Design a protein around this ligand. Structure first.
Ligand SMILES: CC(C)Nc1cc(N[C@H]2CC[C@H](N)CC2)nc2c(C#N)cnn12
Length: 282
């Protein structure tokens, strides 16, 4: 759109391409997403209102000549690239902690307004030079080829629950937490059943004891194999006891048992939280 000069393509998305761009009438540099219903219009207009330091700012919605552009604040790296960059050494735990804590704050905000992300993944998490981490694409899922990753998907989604809650985002972030610690994807599924079966092999096949109502889930099958739960000391070493306590609460099968973002903020793991600055080279 005429008011913006593209500077570079900064990624492919689900809904379209993302450009780094410069506004001519503000001089501001940004991230310009090109998308493809008034419902979608109203939903997005809602998002322009949920402003939080840990949510990528939606600057402007441009519904011109019947295409849709979303103008966001620009950030210089995402967490996936940073992870890949930190791999030989791993992200220091104090930064993992700070990142988790900030994200939890962003979630507690979104969720308190009844807005879910639905699709948390490292690629949707964006970082700056100042030690901040922000959720991007928040709200688009409920508002609207390269394969979409299943790795972070909550089990109730995989089992065909149509009415997810805020807990699906806690799950995702817990998968993200585990991955930052270990330097390997927690559950790298390459189909819905592989993804489910990886969850099962690690946390154990859910039943009515741990997850009441699980056997009445739409895509649940009495024929699922019955794997034993592993020890968390095996899953994410060498995360401490507080860290492992927290992760287990984020990965609870029953979404009603699963810790909230707000309760997670009070967990003892955060007793000593700080705000380190990452070494990122741009
Ligand atoms: C320089 C770069 C890290 N800045 C980016 C990239 C980016 N890519 C999107 C691709 C599609 C994904 N589902 C989500 C991330 N998006 C943004 C924003 C936004 N919004 C701001 N900076 N960046």
């Amino acid at each position: 759109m005429e008011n913006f000069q593209k500077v570079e393509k900064i990624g492919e998305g689900t809904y379209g391409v993302v450009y780094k761009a410069r506004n001519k009438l503000t001089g501001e540099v940004v991230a310009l997403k090109k998308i493809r219903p008034s419902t979608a219009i109203r939903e997005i207009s809602l998002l322009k209102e949920l402003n939080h330091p840990n949510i990528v700012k939606l600057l402007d919605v441009i519904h011109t000549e019947n295409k849709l552009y979303l103008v966001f604040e620009f950030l210089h790296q995402d967490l996936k690239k940073f992870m890949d960059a930190s791999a030989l050494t791993g992200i220091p735990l104090p930064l993992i902690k700070s990142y988790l804590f900030q994200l939890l704050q962003g979630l507690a905000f979104c969720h308190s307004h009844r807005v879910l992300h639905r699709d948390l993944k490292p690629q949707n998490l964006l970082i700056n030079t100042e030690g901040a981490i922000k959720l991007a694409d928040f709200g688009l899922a409920r508002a609207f080829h390269e394969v979409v990753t299943l790795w972070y998907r909550a089990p109730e989604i995989l089992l065909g629950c149509k009415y997810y809650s805020t807990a699906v985002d806690i799950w995702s972030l817990g998968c993200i937490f585990a991955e930052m610690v270990t330097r390997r994807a927690l559950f790298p599924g390459d189909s819905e059943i592989d993804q489910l079966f990886r969850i099962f092999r690690t946390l154990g096949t859910p039943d009515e004891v741990v997850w009441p109502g699980v056997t009445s889930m739409p895509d649940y099958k009495p024929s699922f194999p019955k794997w034993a739960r592993q020890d968390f000391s095996k899953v994410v070493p060498p995360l401490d006891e507080d860290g492992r306590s927290l992760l287990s609460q984020m990965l609870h099968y029953d979404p009603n048992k699963r810790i909230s973002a707000k309760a997670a903020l009070a967990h003892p793991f955060f007793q000593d939280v700080t705000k380190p600055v990452p070494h990122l080279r741009l």
